[PDB]
Amino acid sequence: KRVFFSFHYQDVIDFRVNVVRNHWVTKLNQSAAGVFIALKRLINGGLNNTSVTCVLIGSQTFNRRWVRYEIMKSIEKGNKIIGIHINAFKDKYGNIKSKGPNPFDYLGYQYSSDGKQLHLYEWTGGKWEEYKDLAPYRVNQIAPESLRGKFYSLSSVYRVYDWVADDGYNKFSSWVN
């Protein structure tokens, strides 16, 4: 499978992102996409010809505008989506850090009462607000009453791993498959 990696730029600079990305692309010789209305177009193109989105979670990832977009756009496109904490191993400065917030806790959705549309929300610091960088969209899929008119945080939907705790060295390819 072709994997879209989503991340804070600072985690690229600190050689945290490359630990996971190099495992997939070099060690396992697979292929990745990633970015480090125009910028959305670029990201959309990156997400095209991928089937899995992998959010690499560092200290500030939860707060990044285009990480949020990459996640929301990934849902609309029907990508598999997972998160992986990347703070538990040493960065290029030789430091280990505590886990950052789960980006999925800061994003959410609600199905419309007729079940035909999906409304999108993000946490803006003191409240939930309608998400502005991606429009609500039509779901062509069945939407049972038990799913309608209820708010869900994305952390109730997508799975999060830790590279060290969950042994990504042995298990990453299973997480995206």
Residue numbers in the entry: 3 to 38, 52 to 192
From the paper:
The Thoeris system is composed of two genes, thsA and thsB. In the present study, we report structural and functional analyses of the ThsA and ThsB proteins from the B. cereus Thoeris defense system. Crystal structures of ThsA and ThsB were determined to resolutions of 2.5 and 1.8 Å, respectively. Combined with previous findings, these results advance our understanding of the molecular mechanism underlying the Thoeris defense system and suggest that NAD+ degradation is a previously unknown strategy for bacterial antiphage resistance.
